[PDB]
């Protein structure tokens, strides 16, 4: 759902992905409602656009 509705990754691309944990940077006692995304699209995604 992230590789078809928000941003896909080409098979032949340079570089890679670095990831970590954001429990001490994103979690709040009032809830995490500020962040938004997309999860509905009729078709697939062309490379590198928003």
């Amino acid at each position, epitope marked *: *759902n992230i590789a078809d509705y928000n941003y896909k990754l080409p098979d032949d691309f340079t570089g890679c992905v670095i990831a970590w944990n954001s429990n001490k940077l994103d979690s709040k006692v009032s*809830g995490n*409602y500020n962040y*938004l995304y997309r*999860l*509905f699209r009729k078709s697939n995604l062309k490379p590198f656009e928003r």
Partner: antibody, heavy 120, light 104 residues
Framework: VQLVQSGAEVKKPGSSVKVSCKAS????????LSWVRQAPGQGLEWMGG????????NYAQKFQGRVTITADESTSTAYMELSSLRSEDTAVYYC????????????????????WGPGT | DIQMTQSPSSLSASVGDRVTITCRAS??????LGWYQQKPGKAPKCLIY???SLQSGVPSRFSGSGSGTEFTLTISSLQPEDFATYFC?????????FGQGTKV
């Protein structure tokens, strides 16, 4: 959140059948409440899910014009009244809070169907 | 309306085999994936959150594999408490299906 369904109704035809479901705890608006019918000789089938605040009350085929569904604005209790009792209305009714879009917080797309009718 | 048909539910296997419970599809949907289970006399239970996710509180016995017009429930090794009825969930208008399961 926990769902408690209503008791047994009258088996004799000529009147209406009423099913009630109470969502104790977590009374949140815009959560759909779906009703399902289960038979000993037939699989379960969907009829409708009620949304309290948006007002959309979309039904399914072959029972339109015979059902009236109401619910409180802050969820709590929900009632479904169905008229035109016939000889093929022997079944059991279950209710589940159907996970739809939430406009107030956009929080959960589908929390997990954990609440259901206990069975009467 | 329309009916979303299925293969017959006369599926049975011994302990240690692979079950191939089949739910067909005439269309394709993504965010409506999910299965329900029902033992006779008890409340229904959700089987999977989606096709790629499992329920919080289920083992890896049930696996739901499906991305297009076919959907399968697969068992690595069977359990004596598997005797229930399984129903796949498809389409926004929600046409429910038929399910039956008994090892014999």
């Amino acid at each position: 959140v926990q769902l408690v369904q209503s008791g047994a109704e009258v088996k004799k035809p000529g009147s209406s059948v009423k099913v009630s479901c109470k969502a104790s705890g977590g009374t949140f608006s815009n959560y759909a409440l779906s009703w399902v019918r289960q038979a000993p000789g037939q699989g379960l089938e969907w009829m409708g899910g009620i949304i309290p605040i948006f007002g959309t009350t979309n039904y399914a085929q072959k029972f339109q014009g015979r059902v009236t569904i109401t619910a409180d604005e802050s969820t709590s209790t929900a009632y479904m009244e169905l008229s035109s009792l016939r000889s093929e209305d022997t079944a059991v009714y279950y209710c589940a809070r159907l996970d739809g879009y939430s406009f107030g917080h956009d929080r959960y797309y589908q929390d997990g169907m954990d609440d259901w009718g206990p069975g009467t | 309306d329309i009916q979303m048909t299925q293969s017959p539910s006369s599926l049975s296997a011994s302990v240690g085999d692979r079950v191939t419970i089949t739910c067909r599809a005439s269309q394709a949907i993504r965010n409506d994936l999910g299965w329900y289970q029902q033992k006779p006399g008890k409340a229904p239970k959700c089987l999977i959150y989606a096709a790629s996710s499992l329920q919080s509180g289920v083992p890896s016995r049930f696996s739901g594999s499906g991305s297009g017009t076919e959907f399968t429930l697969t068992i690595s090794s069977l359990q004596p408490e598997d005797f229930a009825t399984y129903f796949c969930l498809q389409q926004n208008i929600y046409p429910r299906t038929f399910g039956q399961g008994t090892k014999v």
